[PDB]
Structures are given as structure tokens and as C-alpha cells.
Write a protein that holds these residues in place. Structure first.
Motif, PDB file in Angstrom:
ATOM      1  N   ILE A   1       5.995 -14.816  -6.698  1.00 15.32           N
ATOM      2  CA  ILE A   1       6.561 -16.124  -6.397  1.00 15.32           C
ATOM      3  C   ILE A   1       5.686 -16.788  -5.328  1.00 15.32           C
ATOM      4  O   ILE A   1       5.684 -16.369  -4.169  1.00 15.32           O
ATOM      5  N   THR A   2       4.871 -17.766  -5.736  1.00 14.58           N
ATOM      6  CA  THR A   2       4.061 -18.567  -4.827  1.00 14.58           C
ATOM      7  C   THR A   2       4.908 -19.711  -4.300  1.00 14.58           C
ATOM      8  O   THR A   2       5.679 -20.312  -5.047  1.00 14.58           O
ATOM      9  N   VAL A   3       4.746 -19.988  -3.012  1.00 18.98           N
ATOM     10  CA  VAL A   3       5.428 -21.006  -2.245  1.00 18.98           C
ATOM     11  C   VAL A   3       4.320 -21.690  -1.442  1.00 18.98           C
ATOM     12  O   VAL A   3       3.384 -21.030  -0.981  1.00 18.98           O
ATOM     13  N   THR A   4       4.349 -23.014  -1.325  1.00 18.94           N
ATOM     14  CA  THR A   4       3.320 -23.780  -0.649  1.00 18.94           C
ATOM     15  C   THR A   4       3.966 -24.979  -0.025  1.00 18.94           C
ATOM     16  O   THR A   4       4.758 -25.659  -0.658  1.00 18.94           O
ATOM     17  N   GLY A   5       3.634 -25.247   1.222  1.00 19.79           N
ATOM     18  CA  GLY A   5       4.142 -26.430   1.870  1.00 19.79           C
ATOM     19  C   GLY A   5       4.210 -26.136   3.366  1.00 19.79           C
ATOM     20  O   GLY A   5       3.210 -26.267   4.064  1.00 19.79           O
ATOM     21  N   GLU A   6       5.377 -25.665   3.821  1.00 18.63           N
ATOM     22  CA  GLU A   6       5.651 -25.220   5.185  1.00 18.63           C
ATOM     23  C   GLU A   6       6.977 -24.432   5.214  1.00 18.63           C
ATOM     24  O   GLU A   6       7.876 -24.724   6.001  1.00 18.63           O
ATOM     25  N   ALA A   7       7.130 -23.424   4.345  1.00 23.27           N
ATOM     26  CA  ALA A   7       8.342 -22.607   4.305  1.00 23.27           C
ATOM     27  C   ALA A   7       8.048 -21.187   3.826  1.00 23.27           C
ATOM     28  O   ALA A   7       6.971 -20.912   3.298  1.00 23.27           O
ATOM     29  N   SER A   8       9.025 -20.295   4.019  1.00 25.02           N
ATOM     30  CA  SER A   8       8.932 -18.868   3.744  1.00 25.02           C
ATOM     31  C   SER A   8       9.968 -18.439   2.708  1.00 25.02           C
ATOM     32  O   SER A   8      10.929 -19.169   2.459  1.00 25.02           O
ATOM     33  N   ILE A   9       9.789 -17.229   2.151  1.00 23.18           N
ATOM     34  CA  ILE A   9      10.685 -16.678   1.137  1.00 23.18           C
ATOM     35  C   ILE A   9      12.139 -16.851   1.552  1.00 23.18           C
ATOM     36  O   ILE A   9      12.889 -17.355   0.746  1.00 23.18           O
ATOM     37  N   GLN A  10      12.527 -16.532   2.792  1.00 20.45           N
ATOM     38  CA  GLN A  10      13.894 -16.618   3.321  1.00 20.45           C
ATOM     39  C   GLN A  10      14.747 -17.723   2.677  1.00 20.45           C
ATOM     40  O   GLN A  10      15.861 -17.489   2.209  1.00 20.45           O
ATOM     41  N   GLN A  11      14.209 -18.941   2.632  1.00 17.19           N
ATOM     42  CA  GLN A  11      14.921 -20.075   2.048  1.00 17.19           C
ATOM     43  C   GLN A  11      15.141 -19.864   0.535  1.00 17.19           C
ATOM     44  O   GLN A  11      16.240 -20.012   0.002  1.00 17.19           O
ATOM     45  N   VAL A  12      14.063 -19.486  -0.151  1.00 17.39           N
ATOM     46  CA  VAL A  12      14.031 -19.110  -1.556  1.00 17.39           C
ATOM     47  C   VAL A  12      14.916 -17.881  -1.816  1.00 17.39           C
ATOM     48  O   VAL A  12      15.506 -17.750  -2.886  1.00 17.39           O
ATOM     49  N   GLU A  13      15.006 -16.982  -0.836  1.00 19.94           N
ATOM     50  CA  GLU A  13      15.803 -15.768  -0.842  1.00 19.94           C
ATOM     51  C   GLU A  13      17.261 -16.186  -1.011  1.00 19.94           C
ATOM     52  O   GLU A  13      17.943 -15.750  -1.938  1.00 19.94           O
ATOM     53  N   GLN A  14      17.707 -17.088  -0.126  1.00 19.52           N
ATOM     54  CA  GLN A  14      19.042 -17.665  -0.177  1.00 19.52           C
ATOM     55  C   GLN A  14      19.308 -18.214  -1.577  1.00 19.52           C
ATOM     56  O   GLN A  14      20.276 -17.801  -2.211  1.00 19.52           O
ATOM     57  N   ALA A  15      18.455 -19.120  -2.067  1.00 20.39           N
ATOM     58  CA  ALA A  15      18.542 -19.649  -3.418  1.00 20.39           C
ATOM     59  C   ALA A  15      18.706 -18.516  -4.436  1.00 20.39           C
ATOM     60  O   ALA A  15      19.631 -18.533  -5.247  1.00 20.39           O
ATOM     61  N   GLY A  16      17.832 -17.511  -4.375  1.00 19.39           N
ATOM     62  CA  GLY A  16      17.801 -16.401  -5.300  1.00 19.39           C
ATOM     63  C   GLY A  16      19.104 -15.613  -5.335  1.00 19.39           C
ATOM     64  O   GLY A  16      19.338 -14.882  -6.297  1.00 19.39           O
ATOM     65  N   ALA A  17      19.981 -15.784  -4.337  1.00 21.78           N
ATOM     66  CA  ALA A  17      21.331 -15.250  -4.381  1.00 21.78           C
ATOM     67  C   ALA A  17      22.059 -15.616  -5.679  1.00 21.78           C
ATOM     68  O   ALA A  17      22.989 -14.901  -6.038  1.00 21.78           O
ATOM     69  N   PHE A  18      21.651 -16.670  -6.403  1.00 20.04           N
ATOM     70  CA  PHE A  18      22.231 -16.949  -7.716  1.00 20.04           C
ATOM     71  C   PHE A  18      22.153 -15.744  -8.668  1.00 20.04           C
ATOM     72  O   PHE A  18      23.078 -15.541  -9.449  1.00 20.04           O
TER      73      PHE A  18
END
Length: 71
Positions: free
Chosen positions: A43-60
Motif C-alpha cells: 500500500i503506497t501512500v504519498t502526500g503528508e500522512a502515514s499508515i495510521q490514518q489508512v489503518e483506521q480506514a482499514g478497520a472496515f
């Protein structure tokens, strides 16, 4: 001077769920781009953020993502 990262993810195996994920990332104001493969990849992420935020989302689906490290 790059502000792009990719983390290793395992569990889910469907392009539609990947699409749900990358969009969930795009919803976050901290990130600009995300390129999310899943299945047996990363999972590539680019901008100014870390997995943590995506982690929360991934709780789905309750994913397990790991920040790669070699050092």
C-alpha cells in the motif's frame, strides 16, 4: 524531499476492496496520492500522512499493514 512511502499489507484479495481503500485514503486531507495493491503486496501512500490514518480506514475489513524497515 519525496514524502511518499509504501507499507506491506496482507489479508484482503479484491480489486474492489483495494478501490475502497485508496479512496478511503484520498478522503484524508493529509495524503495526496495512494496506490494500493493488496492480494499479496503493498500500500503506497504519498502526500503528508502515514499508515495510521489508512489503518483506521482499514478497520472496515481489519487489515494488518506493516511499515517495512531495513536498518
Amino acid at each position: 524531499m519525496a514524502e511518499k512511502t509504501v507499507y506491506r499489507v496482507d489479508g484482503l484479495s479484491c480489486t474492489n476492496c483495494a478501490a475502497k481503500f485508496e479512496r478511503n485514503v484520498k478522503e484524508i486531507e493529509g495524503v495526496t496520492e495512494a496506490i494500493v495493491n493488496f492480494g499479496a503486496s503493498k500500500i503506497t501512500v504519498t502526500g503528508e500522512a502515514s499508515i495510521q490514518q489508512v489503518e483506521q480506514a482499514g478497520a472496515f475489513e481489519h487489515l494488518k499493514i506493516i511499515p517495512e524497515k531495513e536498518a
